[PDB]
PDB file of C-alpha atoms in Angstrom:
ATOM      1  CA  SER A   1       3.598  20.891   8.109  1.00  0.00           C
ATOM      2  CA  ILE A   2       3.081  17.127   8.447  1.00  0.00           C
ATOM      3  CA  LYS A   3       6.210  15.081   7.640  1.00  0.00           C
ATOM      4  CA  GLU A   4       6.057  13.047   4.422  1.00  0.00           C
ATOM      5  CA  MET A   5       8.244  10.228   3.172  1.00  0.00           C
ATOM      6  CA  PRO A   6       9.943  11.095  -0.135  1.00  0.00           C
ATOM      7  CA  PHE A   7       9.647   8.709  -3.130  1.00  0.00           C
ATOM      8  CA  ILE A   8      12.544   6.347  -3.917  1.00  0.00           C
ATOM      9  CA  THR A   9      14.660   7.510  -6.883  1.00  0.00           C
ATOM     10  CA  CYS A  10      16.068   5.505  -9.782  1.00  0.00           C
ATOM     11  CA  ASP A  11      19.584   5.586  -8.278  1.00  0.00           C
ATOM     12  CA  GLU A  12      18.342   4.654  -4.808  1.00  0.00           C
ATOM     13  CA  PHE A  13      16.243   1.740  -6.046  1.00  0.00           C
ATOM     14  CA  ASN A  14      19.047   0.276  -8.164  1.00  0.00           C
ATOM     15  CA  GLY A  15      21.219   0.501  -5.066  1.00  0.00           C
ATOM     16  CA  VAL A  16      19.122  -1.635  -2.731  1.00  0.00           C
ATOM     17  CA  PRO A  17      20.305  -5.293  -2.504  1.00  0.00           C
ATOM     18  CA  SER A  18      18.732  -7.606  -5.094  1.00  0.00           C
ATOM     19  CA  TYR A  19      17.177 -10.124  -2.690  1.00  0.00           C
ATOM     20  CA  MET A  20      15.150  -7.294  -1.147  1.00  0.00           C
ATOM     21  CA  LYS A  21      13.804  -6.148  -4.512  1.00  0.00           C
ATOM     22  CA  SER A  22      12.459  -9.634  -5.241  1.00  0.00           C
ATOM     23  CA  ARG A  23       8.943  -9.391  -6.665  1.00  0.00           C
ATOM     24  CA  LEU A  24       8.611  -5.721  -5.744  1.00  0.00           C
ATOM     25  CA  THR A  25       8.643  -3.304  -8.662  1.00  0.00           C
ATOM     26  CA  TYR A  26       9.793   0.315  -8.469  1.00  0.00           C
ATOM     27  CA  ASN A  27       6.269   1.736  -8.933  1.00  0.00           C
ATOM     28  CA  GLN A  28       5.016  -0.710  -6.320  1.00  0.00           C
ATOM     29  CA  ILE A  29       7.285   0.739  -3.636  1.00  0.00           C
ATOM     30  CA  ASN A  30       6.429   4.325  -4.535  1.00  0.00           C
ATOM     31  CA  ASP A  31       2.676   3.535  -4.692  1.00  0.00           C
ATOM     32  CA  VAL A  32       2.913   2.142  -1.150  1.00  0.00           C
ATOM     33  CA  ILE A  33       4.814   5.248   0.001  1.00  0.00           C
ATOM     34  CA  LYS A  34       1.884   7.348  -1.295  1.00  0.00           C
ATOM     35  CA  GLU A  35      -0.511   5.270   0.874  1.00  0.00           C
ATOM     36  CA  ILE A  36       1.678   5.439   3.950  1.00  0.00           C
ATOM     37  CA  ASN A  37       1.859   9.208   3.521  1.00  0.00           C
ATOM     38  CA  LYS A  38      -1.924   9.289   3.244  1.00  0.00           C
ATOM     39  CA  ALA A  39      -2.204   7.497   6.602  1.00  0.00           C
ATOM     40  CA  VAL A  40       0.349   9.812   8.228  1.00  0.00           C
ATOM     41  CA  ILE A  41      -1.514  12.905   7.048  1.00  0.00           C
ATOM     42  CA  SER A  42      -4.905  11.476   8.131  1.00  0.00           C
ATOM     43  CA  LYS A  43      -3.650  10.678  11.609  1.00  0.00           C
ATOM     44  CA  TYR A  44      -1.903  13.993  12.157  1.00  0.00           C
ATOM     45  CA  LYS A  45      -4.816  16.048  10.803  1.00  0.00           C
ATOM     46  CA  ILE A  46      -6.882  14.446  13.585  1.00  0.00           C
ATOM     47  CA  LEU A  47      -4.154  15.188  16.159  1.00  0.00           C
ATOM     48  CA  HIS A  48      -4.079  18.852  15.105  1.00  0.00           C
ATOM     49  CA  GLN A  49      -7.891  19.149  15.023  1.00  0.00           C
ATOM     50  CA  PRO A  50      -9.622  21.310  17.693  1.00  0.00           C
ATOM     51  CA  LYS A  51     -11.122  18.872  20.211  1.00  0.00           C
ATOM     52  CA  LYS A  52     -14.529  20.570  20.193  1.00  0.00           C
ATOM     53  CA  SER A  53     -14.717  19.861  16.452  1.00  0.00           C
ATOM     54  CA  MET A  54     -14.341  16.116  16.980  1.00  0.00           C
ATOM     55  CA  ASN A  55     -17.237  13.718  16.463  1.00  0.00           C
ATOM     56  CA  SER A  56     -17.364  10.373  18.302  1.00  0.00           C
ATOM     57  CA  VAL A  57     -15.405   8.414  15.677  1.00  0.00           C
ATOM     58  CA  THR A  58     -12.669  11.045  15.483  1.00  0.00           C
ATOM     59  CA  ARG A  59     -12.414  11.246  19.274  1.00  0.00           C
ATOM     60  CA  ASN A  60     -11.952   7.460  19.472  1.00  0.00           C
ATOM     61  CA  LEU A  61      -9.064   7.645  16.968  1.00  0.00           C
ATOM     62  CA  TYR A  62      -7.623  10.638  18.786  1.00  0.00           C
ATOM     63  CA  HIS A  63      -7.640   8.613  22.016  1.00  0.00           C
ATOM     64  CA  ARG A  64      -5.839   5.693  20.425  1.00  0.00           C
ATOM     65  CA  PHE A  65      -3.234   8.087  18.957  1.00  0.00           C
ATOM     66  CA  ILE A  66      -2.561   9.508  22.427  1.00  0.00           C
ATOM     67  CA  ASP A  67      -2.379   5.994  23.936  1.00  0.00           C
ATOM     68  CA  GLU A  68       0.365   5.205  21.410  1.00  0.00           C
ATOM     69  CA  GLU A  69       2.650   8.180  22.225  1.00  0.00           C
ATOM     70  CA  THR A  70       5.859   7.615  24.175  1.00  0.00           C
ATOM     71  CA  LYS A  71       8.760   9.808  25.233  1.00  0.00           C
ATOM     72  CA  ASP A  72      10.623   8.469  22.185  1.00  0.00           C
ATOM     73  CA  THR A  73       7.895   9.654  19.793  1.00  0.00           C
ATOM     74  CA  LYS A  74       7.539  13.192  21.139  1.00  0.00           C
ATOM     75  CA  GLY A  75       7.674  15.720  18.311  1.00  0.00           C
ATOM     76  CA  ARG A  76       8.034  12.893  15.798  1.00  0.00           C
ATOM     77  CA  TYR A  77       5.680  11.477  13.189  1.00  0.00           C
ATOM     78  CA  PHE A  78       4.743   7.804  13.296  1.00  0.00           C
ATOM     79  CA  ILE A  79       2.010   5.323  12.382  1.00  0.00           C
ATOM     80  CA  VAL A  80       1.249   1.773  13.440  1.00  0.00           C
ATOM     81  CA  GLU A  81      -0.370  -1.132  11.574  1.00  0.00           C
ATOM     82  CA  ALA A  82      -3.862  -0.135  12.732  1.00  0.00           C
ATOM     83  CA  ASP A  83      -3.412   3.191  10.901  1.00  0.00           C
ATOM     84  CA  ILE A  84      -2.641   1.472   7.603  1.00  0.00           C
ATOM     85  CA  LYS A  85      -5.864  -0.497   8.092  1.00  0.00           C
ATOM     86  CA  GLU A  86      -7.827   2.558   9.247  1.00  0.00           C
ATOM     87  CA  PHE A  87      -6.946   4.949   6.454  1.00  0.00           C
ATOM     88  CA  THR A  88      -5.844   2.814   3.441  1.00  0.00           C
ATOM     89  CA  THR A  89      -6.851  -0.240   1.479  1.00  0.00           C
ATOM     90  CA  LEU A  90      -3.299  -1.551   1.755  1.00  0.00           C
ATOM     91  CA  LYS A  91      -3.141  -5.178   2.845  1.00  0.00           C
ATOM     92  CA  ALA A  92      -0.678  -5.590   5.726  1.00  0.00           C
ATOM     93  CA  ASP A  93       0.682  -8.939   4.526  1.00  0.00           C
ATOM     94  CA  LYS A  94       4.022 -10.656   3.835  1.00  0.00           C
ATOM     95  CA  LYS A  95       4.794  -8.511   0.797  1.00  0.00           C
ATOM     96  CA  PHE A  96       3.966  -5.393   2.864  1.00  0.00           C
ATOM     97  CA  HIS A  97       6.589  -6.154   5.533  1.00  0.00           C
ATOM     98  CA  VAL A  98       9.095  -6.909   2.779  1.00  0.00           C
ATOM     99  CA  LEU A  99       8.226  -3.444   1.433  1.00  0.00           C
ATOM    100  CA  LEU A 100       8.712  -1.943   4.911  1.00  0.00           C
ATOM    101  CA  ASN A 101      12.187  -3.483   5.007  1.00  0.00           C
ATOM    102  CA  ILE A 102      13.153  -1.671   1.797  1.00  0.00           C
ATOM    103  CA  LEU A 103      11.851   1.551   3.400  1.00  0.00           C
ATOM    104  CA  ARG A 104      14.030   1.004   6.480  1.00  0.00           C
ATOM    105  CA  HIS A 105      17.036   0.308   4.234  1.00  0.00           C
ATOM    106  CA  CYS A 106      16.395   3.503   2.256  1.00  0.00           C
ATOM    107  CA  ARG A 107      16.159   5.323   5.596  1.00  0.00           C
ATOM    108  CA  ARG A 108      12.557   6.419   5.060  1.00  0.00           C
ATOM    109  CA  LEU A 109      11.345   5.050   8.415  1.00  0.00           C
ATOM    110  CA  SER A 110      12.618   3.267  11.512  1.00  0.00           C
ATOM    111  CA  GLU A 111      10.951   1.367  14.372  1.00  0.00           C
ATOM    112  CA  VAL A 112      10.127   2.378  17.949  1.00  0.00           C
ATOM    113  CA  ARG A 113       8.924  -0.605  19.987  1.00  0.00           C
ATOM    114  CA  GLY A 114       7.672  -0.855  23.563  1.00  0.00           C
ATOM    115  CA  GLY A 115       4.275  -1.513  25.065  1.00  0.00           C
ATOM    116  CA  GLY A 116       4.306  -4.493  22.723  1.00  0.00           C
ATOM    117  CA  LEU A 117       3.644  -2.117  19.852  1.00  0.00           C
ATOM    118  CA  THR A 118       5.732  -1.486  16.762  1.00  0.00           C
ATOM    119  CA  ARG A 119       5.697   2.129  15.657  1.00  0.00           C
ATOM    120  CA  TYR A 120       6.986   3.199  12.252  1.00  0.00           C
ATOM    121  CA  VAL A 121       8.624   6.572  12.659  1.00  0.00           C
ATOM    122  CA  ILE A 122       8.822   8.693   9.570  1.00  0.00           C
ATOM    123  CA  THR A 123      12.385   9.597   8.476  1.00  0.00           C
TER     124      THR A 123
END
């Protein structure tokens, strides 16, 4: 029952301010949403995995996921930049943070900081 980010619609996309849209095409934003969802699912499948079934690489990820929990993330779904790198071939560059800003505007994610870490909380 892992939480996924819904695709942006025609109406929604036409309604985000022009300067944000910039270079970014409509399929571009939705393609990125697919990849972010892939990372969310990958992370949370590991979290829900029986610990005795974990190999060394999975346990190391599991440990990092636990290190990144806070009281503000309890019962919520989030990823960080390392997850994008771990589970996707998405480049976390300038265009990517521009993309993230459209996602925040369309209320698909928000940010939980602290511990010097930016967490992207789904929804």
